[PDB]
Nucleic acid binder design. Structure first.
Ligand SMILES: [Mg+2]
Ligand SMILES: [Mg+2]
Ligand SMILES: [Mg+2]
Ligand SMILES: [Mg+2]
Ligand SMILES: [Mg+2]
Ligand SMILES: [Mg+2]
Ligand SMILES: [Mg+2]
Ligand SMILES: [Mg+2]
Ligand SMILES: [Mg+2]
Ligand SMILES: [Mg+2]
Ligand SMILES: [Mg+2]
Ligand SMILES: [Mg+2]
Ligand SMILES: [Mg+2]
Ligand SMILES: [Mg+2]
Ligand SMILES: [Mg+2]
Ligand SMILES: [Mg+2]
Ligand SMILES: [Mg+2]
Ligand SMILES: [Mg+2]
Ligand SMILES: [Mg+2]
Ligand SMILES: [Mg+2]
Ligand SMILES: [Mg+2]
Ligand SMILES: [Mg+2]
Ligand SMILES: [Mg+2]
Ligand SMILES: [Mg+2]
Ligand SMILES: [Mg+2]
Ligand SMILES: [Mg+2]
Ligand SMILES: [Mg+2]
Ligand SMILES: [Mg+2]
Ligand SMILES: [Mg+2]
Ligand SMILES: [Mg+2]
Ligand SMILES: [Mg+2]
Ligand SMILES: [Mg+2]
Ligand SMILES: [Mg+2]
Ligand SMILES: [Mg+2]
Ligand SMILES: [Mg+2]
Ligand SMILES: [Mg+2]
Ligand SMILES: [Mg+2]
Ligand SMILES: [Mg+2]
Ligand SMILES: [Mg+2]
Ligand SMILES: [Mg+2]
Ligand SMILES: [Mg+2]
Ligand SMILES: [Mg+2]
Ligand SMILES: [Mg+2]
Ligand SMILES: [Mg+2]
Ligand SMILES: [Mg+2]
Ligand SMILES: [Mg+2]
Ligand SMILES: [Mg+2]
Ligand SMILES: [Mg+2]
Ligand SMILES: [Mg+2]
Ligand SMILES: [Mg+2]
Ligand SMILES: [Mg+2]
Ligand SMILES: [Mg+2]
Ligand SMILES: [Mg+2]
Ligand SMILES: [Mg+2]
Ligand SMILES: [Mg+2]
Ligand SMILES: [Mg+2]
Ligand SMILES: [Mg+2]
Ligand SMILES: [Mg+2]
Ligand SMILES: [Mg+2]
Ligand SMILES: [Mg+2]
Ligand SMILES: [Mg+2]
Ligand SMILES: [Mg+2]
Ligand SMILES: [Mg+2]
Ligand SMILES: [Mg+2]
Ligand SMILES: [Mg+2]
Ligand SMILES: [Mg+2]
Ligand SMILES: [Mg+2]
Ligand SMILES: [Mg+2]
Ligand SMILES: [Mg+2]
Ligand SMILES: [Mg+2]
Ligand SMILES: [Mg+2]
Ligand SMILES: [Mg+2]
Ligand SMILES: [Mg+2]
Ligand SMILES: [Mg+2]
Ligand SMILES: [Mg+2]
Ligand SMILES: [Mg+2]
Ligand SMILES: [Mg+2]
Ligand SMILES: [Mg+2]
Ligand SMILES: [Mg+2]
Ligand SMILES: [Mg+2]
Ligand SMILES: [Mg+2]
Ligand SMILES: [Mg+2]
Ligand SMILES: [Mg+2]
Ligand SMILES: [Mg+2]
Ligand SMILES: [Mg+2]
Ligand SMILES: [Mg+2]
Ligand SMILES: [Mg+2]
Ligand SMILES: [Mg+2]
Ligand SMILES: [Mg+2]
Ligand SMILES: [Mg+2]
Ligand SMILES: [Mg+2]
Ligand SMILES: [Mg+2]
Ligand SMILES: [Mg+2]
Ligand SMILES: [Mg+2]
Ligand SMILES: [Mg+2]
Ligand SMILES: [Mg+2]
Ligand SMILES: [Mg+2]
Ligand SMILES: [Mg+2]
Ligand SMILES: [Mg+2]
Ligand SMILES: [Mg+2]
Ligand SMILES: [Mg+2]
Ligand SMILES: [Zn+2]
Lengths: 174, 204, 37, 140, 16
RNA sequence: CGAUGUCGGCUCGUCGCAUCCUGGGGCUGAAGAAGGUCCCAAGGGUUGGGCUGUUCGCCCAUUAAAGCGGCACGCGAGCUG
RNA sequence: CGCUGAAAGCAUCUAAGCGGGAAGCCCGCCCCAAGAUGAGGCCUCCCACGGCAGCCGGUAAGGACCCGGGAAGACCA
């Protein structure tokens, strides 16, 4: 029934150093800084990072759970890494990689060419399935969201860009 | 941002691809540079251009020393082109080639004291049906006790024209370097003989 | 989006939240989306 | 006896670092310096306050949501000519006006008050050109 | 007109 | 009440926004197209004519649209009457 | 409309933080503008005149007056 007090397992060898209002997480896949409220305290133990709040007032309880997850996400980010998948659906709809870029054919009068931000890598296996990959979890989700917005699921037809595991809830037409 | 000083000479029309293109003809160069405005010295970037030779017997000592430091013959007009730094020390019509687009700044023709119908295209009054001495009059100029005054900027009679006008995005139809001539499609502010400034367009 | 002075839950899936000084009712049924105003 | 009136004094020059100080609470003291009410010979109808140089005016501080919500206002006289500039943008364009506007509204209106405003010299950034006057650094 | 005789102010010339 | 000229039209604007159009939206009993309803938005735009003193209204032909109100039922030391 | 995300093990556009997004807002374009008395800046010219922050005079660089005019203009400019 609590997230802030949940100890953070740390794989080996990802290192986590604490600094005023920022923790620095270094791992195999890269590095990430996590800006932390000075009101919390981040504690490093044997292969385990922990966070403590100074009181039980709501701003401290609210910051507490947040701060633990932000650090846990960076630790998973530099070791496992993060990724999201997108499923293209629709008859003429497909995707292909061009250099490091992502080119979308989703029913417009033109292709749509998405360029990967620094720290993000695009891969197209099947021409109908895209995977967004990176070490920053928010950044991975942001890019994935950006791509999906180019052609959202239709309300009436199984056409458009879909999240992997996104239900197909359609409504009748005539 | 290229620019050059010039004099409006007059209008005609030429024929280009079985079309008649109205042109106004501008005698642009040559424009010697007499001073450069640097960010270190002046806070901005510009060239002071000279234009049209002047009888040295007419040029006072303060001006004559300005020309001296430039190594330039006395000239009748000095105007700056902002954000223009030409490689040479002389600017000529050949900074424009046909097809480019320009903005031309002149002093419009001066109508003196212009009534409200010429200056602001007001509708005047009726010319019959009882209209009493108000045929060219502007009508109401306000409300009543609220606000009991007349807006700043109210359109009223007064001097009109003889003011700076820039007309923009004019196609350069031709340039005749042999004669410092510059043909431009359309109309340009001011009278024949007026001084004009020709600048690369700011439209895209 | 319904916009009204009385924002209430309509079904058991409706959720009352507070975004940027305003009260919303978000829900999986798009008709149940409400903003107070 | 009659109340002592001073002969013309030599004004003091004074330096203040505005960094991190609250806008209104700093302006209150600068106003007091400007009026000279910190002097035991304060006369209400002449200028005898100090000259006040202020640095780092761009790093003045404010509470609440005032960066977004404090609106400076100017009226041109023309129809529809009420302009509105929030604190944020005023700070990002003419940061010295934020302090100047606050001190200005805390000075007396009239000729003397206008002169006293001229004895304020507000600068953004850590430096000022009045080295010649050798201002005494004040703590407020 | 005020003038003539139904009204009586603001509106016509001398007569009195 | 030792006078604060009274409808409408014309002229000239200017403001409000409870928005007629144009721009941005959510919901739709939204297939598409076209609507409905609500939200944001006052930058600009908001036609010509027949009838009547008319304001309004009806009608004709169009329109992206033919918005509603305030300014002494805006404005007669500006006109009309 | 989102991303990430607690309080509240889930969920949440938000409480920390980050995106997208209007003919509207700020710039950008055109014109006025240092009486902006906070009277700005740059280039050039004259200069240490003779008499008891002041006075009277002769000048310097310059300017005005007068005149011939002007697609400038009521006069003025
Ligand atoms: Mg001719
Ligand atoms: Mg040709
Ligand atoms: Mg033709
Ligand atoms: Mg000339
Ligand atoms: Mg001209
Ligand atoms: Mg000119
Ligand atoms: Mg002229
Ligand atoms: Mg003309
Ligand atoms: Mg007229
Ligand atoms: Mg006309
Ligand atoms: Mg005209
Ligand atoms: Mg006109
Ligand atoms: Mg005009
Ligand atoms: Mg008319
Ligand atoms: Mg008419
Ligand atoms: Mg007429
Ligand atoms: Mg007539
Ligand atoms: Mg009559
Ligand atoms: Mg009359
Ligand atoms: Mg007549
Ligand atoms: Mg009139
Ligand atoms: Mg009145
Ligand atoms: Mg009236
Ligand atoms: Mg008034
Ligand atoms: Mg004039
Ligand atoms: Mg003009
Ligand atoms: Mg064109
Ligand atoms: Mg020639
Ligand atoms: Mg939900
Ligand atoms: Mg005494
Ligand atoms: Mg203080
Ligand atoms: Mg003090
Ligand atoms: Mg004082
Ligand atoms: Mg005093
Ligand atoms: Mg604030
Ligand atoms: Mg008072
Ligand atoms: Mg009478
Ligand atoms: Mg009465
Ligand atoms: Mg009387
Ligand atoms: Mg009276
Ligand atoms: Mg009377
Ligand atoms: Mg009276
Ligand atoms: Mg509204
Ligand atoms: Mg409003
Ligand atoms: Mg309504
Ligand atoms: Mg609309
Ligand atoms: Mg729309
Ligand atoms: Mg809609
Ligand atoms: Mg149904
Ligand atoms: Mg249908
Ligand atoms: Mg549709
Ligand atoms: Mg709504
Ligand atoms: Mg509007
Ligand atoms: Mg308005
Ligand atoms: Mg309107
Ligand atoms: Mg009509
Ligand atoms: Mg008829
Ligand atoms: Mg009619
Ligand atoms: Mg009618
Ligand atoms: Mg009426
Ligand atoms: Mg009727
Ligand atoms: Mg009827
Ligand atoms: Mg339409
Ligand atoms: Mg219609
Ligand atoms: Mg109305
Ligand atoms: Mg009223
Ligand atoms: Mg109106
Ligand atoms: Mg009424
Ligand atoms: Mg009535
Ligand atoms: Mg009335
Ligand atoms: Mg009206
Ligand atoms: Mg009358
Ligand atoms: Mg009337
Ligand atoms: Mg009236
Ligand atoms: Mg009146
Ligand atoms: Mg009257
Ligand atoms: Mg009156
Ligand atoms: Mg009559
Ligand atoms: Mg009659
Ligand atoms: Mg009658
Ligand atoms: Mg969601
Ligand atoms: Mg979420
Ligand atoms: Mg926040
Ligand atoms: Mg944003
Ligand atoms: Mg987005
Ligand atoms: Mg446009
Ligand atoms: Mg706005
Ligand atoms: Mg100018
Ligand atoms: Mg000046
Ligand atoms: Mg100037
Ligand atoms: Mg002057
Ligand atoms: Mg001022
Ligand atoms: Mg002064
Ligand atoms: Mg002064
Ligand atoms: Mg000065
Ligand atoms: Mg000056
Ligand atoms: Mg300067
Ligand atoms: Mg002389
Ligand atoms: Mg003359
Ligand atoms: Mg004259
Ligand atoms: Mg004359
Ligand atoms: Zn519901």
């Amino acid at each position: 029934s609590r997230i802030g007090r949940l100890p953070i397992p740390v794989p080996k060898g990802v290192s986590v150093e604490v600094a005023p209002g920022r923790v620095k997480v270094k791992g195999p896949k890269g590095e990430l800084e996590v800006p932390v409220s000075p009101e919390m305290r981040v504690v490093v133990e044997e292969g385990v990072v922990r966070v403590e709040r100074p009181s039980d007032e709501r701003r401290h309880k609210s910051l507490h759970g947040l701060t633990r997850t932000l650090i846990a996400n960076a630790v998973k980010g530099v070791s496992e890494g993060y990724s999201k998948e997108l499923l293209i659906k629709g008859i003429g709809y497909r995707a292909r990689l061009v250099g490091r870029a992502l080119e979308l054919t989703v029913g417009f009068s033109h292709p749509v060419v998405v360029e990967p931000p620094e720290g993000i890598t695009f891969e197209v296996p099947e021409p109908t399935r895209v995977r967004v990959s990176g070490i920053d979890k928010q950044k991975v989700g942001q890019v994935a969201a950006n791509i999906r917005a180019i052609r959202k699921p239709s309300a009436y037809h199984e056409k458009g860009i879909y999240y992997a595991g996104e239900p197909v809830r359609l409504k009748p037409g005539k | 941002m290229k620019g050059i000083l010039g004099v409006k000479v007059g209008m005609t029309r030429i024929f280009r691809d079985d079309r008649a293109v109205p042109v106004t003809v501008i005698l642009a160069g040559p424009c010697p540079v007499v001073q450069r405005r640097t960010p270190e010295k002046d806070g901005y970037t510009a060239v002071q251009l000279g234009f049209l030779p002047q009888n040295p017997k007419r040029v006072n000592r303060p001006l004559k020393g300005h020309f001296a430091k430039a190594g330039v013959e006395p000239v009748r007009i000095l105007r700056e082109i902002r954000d223009f730094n030409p490689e040479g020390d002389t600017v000529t019509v050949e900074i424009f080639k046909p097809g480019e687009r320009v903005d031309v700044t002149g002093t419009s023709k001066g109508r003196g004291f212009a009534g409200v119908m010429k200056r602001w295209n007001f509708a005047g009054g009726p010319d019959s049906h009882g209209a009493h001495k108000i045929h060219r009059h502007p009508g109401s100029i306000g409300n009543r006790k609220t606000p009991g005054r007349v807006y700043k900027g109210k359109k009223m009679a007064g001097h009109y024209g003889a003011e700076r006008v820039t007309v923009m995005n004019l196609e350069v139809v031709d340039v005749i370097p042999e004669e410092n001539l510059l043909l431009v499609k359309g109309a340009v502010p001011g009278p024949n003989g007026g001084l004009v400034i020709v600048r690369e367009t700011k439209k895209a | 989006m319904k916009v009204r002075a009385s924002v209430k839950r309509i079904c058991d899936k409706c959720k009352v939240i507070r975004r940027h000084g305003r009260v919303y009712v978000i829900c999986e049924n798009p008709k149940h989306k409400q903003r107070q105003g | 006896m009659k109340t002592y009136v001073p002969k013309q004094v030599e004004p003091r020059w004074v330096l203040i670092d505005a960094e991190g100080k609250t806008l209104g609470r700093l302006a209150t003291k600068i106003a007091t310096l400007l009026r000279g009410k910190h002097r035991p010979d304060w006369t209400p109808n002449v200028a005898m306050g100090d000259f006040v140089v202020v640095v780092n005016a761009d790093k003045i501080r404010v509470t609440g949501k005032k960066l977004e919500q404090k609106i400076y206002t100017r009226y041109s006289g023309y129809p529809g000519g009420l302009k509105k500039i929030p604190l944020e943008k005023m700070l990002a364009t003419h940061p010295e006006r934020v302090l100047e506007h606050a001190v200005k509204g805390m000075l007396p209106k009239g000729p003397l008050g206008r002169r006293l405003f001229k004895r304020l010299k507000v600068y953004a950034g850590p430096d000022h050109p009045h080295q010649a006057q050798r201002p005494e650094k004040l703590e407020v | 007109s005020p003038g003539n005789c139904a009204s009586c102010s603001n509106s016509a010339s001398a007569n009195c």
